[PDB]
Design a protein around this ligand. Sequence first.
Ligand SMILES: [Zn+2]
Lengths: 344, 140, 62
Amino acid sequence: KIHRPRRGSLAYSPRKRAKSIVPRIRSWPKDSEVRMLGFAGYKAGMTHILMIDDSPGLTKGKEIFVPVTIVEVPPLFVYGIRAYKQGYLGLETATEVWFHDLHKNVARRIKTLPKNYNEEAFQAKLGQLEDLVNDGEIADVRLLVHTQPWLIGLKKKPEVMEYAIGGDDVKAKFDYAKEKIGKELRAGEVLHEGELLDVIAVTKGKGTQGPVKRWGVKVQFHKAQRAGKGRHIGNLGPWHPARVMWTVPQAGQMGFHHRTEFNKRLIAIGENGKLVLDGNEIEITPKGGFPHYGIVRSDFLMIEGTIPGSFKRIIRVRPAIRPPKKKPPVERPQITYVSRESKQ
Amino acid sequence: AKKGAGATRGISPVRPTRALPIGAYLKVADNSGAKVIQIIGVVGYKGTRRRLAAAGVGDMVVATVKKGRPDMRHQVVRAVVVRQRKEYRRLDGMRVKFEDNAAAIVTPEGVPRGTEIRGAIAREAAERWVRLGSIASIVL
Amino acid sequence: ARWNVCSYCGREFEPGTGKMFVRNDGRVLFFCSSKCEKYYFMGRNPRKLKWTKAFQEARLQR
RNA sequence: ACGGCCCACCAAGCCGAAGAUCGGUACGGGCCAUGAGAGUGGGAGCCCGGAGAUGGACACUGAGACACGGGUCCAGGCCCUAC
RNA sequence: GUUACUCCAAAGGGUGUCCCUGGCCUUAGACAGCGG
RNA sequence: AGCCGAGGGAACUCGGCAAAUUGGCCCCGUAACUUCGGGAGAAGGGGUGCCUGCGGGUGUGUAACCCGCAGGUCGCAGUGAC
RNA sequence: CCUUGUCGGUUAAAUGCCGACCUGCAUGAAUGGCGUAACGAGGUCCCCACUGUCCCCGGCUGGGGCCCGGCGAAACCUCUGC
RNA sequence: CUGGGGAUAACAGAGUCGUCUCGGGCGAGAGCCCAUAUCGACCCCGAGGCUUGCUACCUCGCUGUCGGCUCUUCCCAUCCUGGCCCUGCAGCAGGGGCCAAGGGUGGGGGUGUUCACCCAUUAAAGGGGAACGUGAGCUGGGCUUAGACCGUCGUGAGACAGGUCGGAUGCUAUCUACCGGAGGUGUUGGCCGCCUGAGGGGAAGGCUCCCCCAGUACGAGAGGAACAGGGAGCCGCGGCCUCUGGUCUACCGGUUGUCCUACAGGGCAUAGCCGGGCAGCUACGCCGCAGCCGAUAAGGCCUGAAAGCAUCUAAGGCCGAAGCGGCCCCCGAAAACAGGCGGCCACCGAGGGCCCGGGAAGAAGACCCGGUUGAUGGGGCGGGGAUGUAAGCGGGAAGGGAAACCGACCCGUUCAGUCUGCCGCUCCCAACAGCCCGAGUGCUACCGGG
Ligand SMILES: [Zn+2]
């Protein structure tokens, strides 16, 4: 008998097409600072830098090559506040409050907007929600946010999302939300340079693939390659049980999956397309523009490593639900070189 | 701190790639009787079903002597890879490769069986085995 | 963060790129591209190629 | 400095059974030992000459060297080191 | 355990509990303890 | 049914199955053994394009078909494909 | 037959191949015995070169497969079908 | 060869367990003395169904095969990894036993082999089951037809659970099963958007080495640990193309033979061959993968009687594992209590689809972006990039020729010429014109309010 591990993981099944291109966040981290727990942007491209190492471990204090991804982040708009209560099993929405003046383009996602809904009505609804929250029934408060893709001329149909707030007092959360609603919100007010983040997006699509590539199955002997079975698995199982088991590798959809990554470091936050290294203001956009993505012009995040998704895809970010015990400092590192040469 | 003055090992932060599987012939660079060796094992390695153990610069291997004075021929020895043809990365990002594949014969502890190495050797190997650069005239 | 100089085309290439080749006699060489590496090893003459600096060298040597 | 010493061209010549070529052993001589002598054997120590300086090759300077206590590289060994 | 049979594991052990019997000490007995 | 693949080079497999390597012409050189006829194209090594000219053979031939020489020059590669 | 017989050589490692030793279960002289140069799409062992055989698989080409229009069968079939 | 036979073998299955694998009871003794650290005769009692036999209940054209490759899963009687107990356990290591099946258990030589044997590594390189798992999955080396040789037996034709060479591998999926992808109905009027998260899946992580603790404890010496703290790597998993490599029948150049009369430009010969090569795809490249909380197992303790003492247990407490549950990741309103919230329409028409220009998406369907309240595709003009310096013109060129002229190749004009499955600006052309679905009800008990 020969032993070896099975081919592929069963933890990401069923391997099907994602429900939506806009990714959903299932869990939130416990933070003591009262702030919005995430942001959203669009992926632009990749480059590399040379920085002085900070994190614990060998290589500390030396100049190292580091791959980098760039995410364009125009400001979000806060258009609503939601209240949650506790039902029999879990949380259930108690009520919603919206802002009265919304951009003309929001109707491309939300086809049915209210007709008149003036400011005094909005304020009365805010007051009702305030008094409701001021009793003790309510358990959680969340913000309702929409992207503004028209500033960077990428498209006009926004993405609409819900974001949680940190802390442990509903009243503090509500004060924050009431001071935020109806306005534009920037990434520098939410994120801190040097943090660890979790990124969420839908992966690149690859269509239907066979088991060699979908599961890491082996290619058969060359006699079978000449017989007509090279890229096939041997058998679907034994005589008894007299059925095919769900654990047997098979062909199907590959790519376009919901996936989450852990502990990617935020290096720097840029403004208006520039980064400030040593007093200078340099452009991240390489000579000729990013391939399949043009010029960065509003604001951008520099994230260490790689992240799921194609280029113009929507990315969501949250802070470190599962960080290690020896975190690196929350401070922008010392950067000696940023590459902005042609990338095609 | 137990034993650092008389020492045979050190640490290197590069970890080159593994370019030479079991069955590879290596030219010997030390001034021992041996001239050509064959890899039959890689010290410290655990693999999987139908995988060949492979080695790169700085790794100790088990080998057999095919050419050289009769005293050494047909024996099983240990040796360290000191240069390889497959390029590997460093910390700044520039890749480095060499002109040939070569090794140097040592004792299971790490002590060379020879007094002279001919040609340049790799700083990774010299760092991981501190008793080699002493007997090497070029270390890049 | 130093820029290296190529031994075939003579141009500067950026940190994090290229190749260093080592000959067993210690002699070192720097390449910016597989193109230049391949041309060096096959034996194309750069003094004849109008996109190198050895070409201006030879133009003076005329 | 004469010279196949080397080169371009024109010829087919040169050595050899009186032993060429190839191999073995060996620094050469003046001299030494022995024997009645004819002869047989040896040729480290003193003199004349030749060659060599771990093995091999190549140069500078000088009247003169391809240099035993000067130089450059390869091979084969060794020594110091803050590597 | 909730099995008539078809179609249900033992030799060897148990201050686990509920009973029967037969001897021996007892108003200073059978442990521990003041005191050899 | 076909083309290419870094580093390693039979670790694959009953078994180098299949694929790959070599390849035309001129010159040099060529073993064991032998039924002296062979082995033998043994093995192995060097060269080959284009242009500018010079010579030889048979021939009455500035007709045709063959055999050599020197020099200049380009390419990663000159039986460059077949 | 016992048998992967014992010794030697070939490997890092030999139920193999080659060379010998005789205990020939059950060799043997025209049901021919022992050798043999040359020859063999015969069977078997080793070496050099070479390679996607393999480490570990990747990319590309053309024809199918898929969709659309047209023509248009057969094997098989108690009834059904967790 | 014909006819039959599961009335009758080989063959898997059923039954049985003599044999096989794994155990136990008692105590002769061995162990310097000391049965029980370890070993344990003779004699008695068992479990499993994984070895072989026995039987002949099933099948005589069900499949009649061994071994290997590939792929999935289960058991524990545990080889390593986690935690403990005794020892004839100083330490380092060893014996023996208890809890635990979450993860691991590999690479090679001869042989058709399974097994066994050997080699070098390794934390260790456990053993079984699933029709001796797996031929409508592969292979075909063995075995078991027809040809042939040797030995032996036989008068012979011939034979040998003796040896050797050679010797056919078919399928258009009817039902179910599984992997993925669509269209409907229902959820008691229709629709747009955001959420919840019952239930299901997870190994998403497992293991090793180095430094220090330390030449310390221990020990006569020789030798030689551990808790905490710092680093690195192997195996597995999930993603990406900045860097490096491969390919790149878009593209750029060089060159052979021939055809279009020669130049220049082209066709054919695998893209004719050779060299380079962006985007894209890929790995030989790069990025990421937690330890805590809670209850337990073996075990270690407290209190405490039955039994005035003693006793971890009979009632009660306190601790204690790579194991169980949660945090975390993936799927998830068909979750039949078939959900919550906000908003729009109905009680002509909200909304949706066909259509048009296109990808970041794609077997058909589906998904995403835009449609003049416009930079979606093309064109033009500019950036970046790949090749490698065009044609023509002029000047040289070894040499030949009275001279004119011929002449492979070189130089200059020239980072040129060609191309761009990338970026930006600009309404110059086309995103026009249309066409199709589409919700409306009543009775009873009403509820809460008129
Ligand atoms: Zn260059």
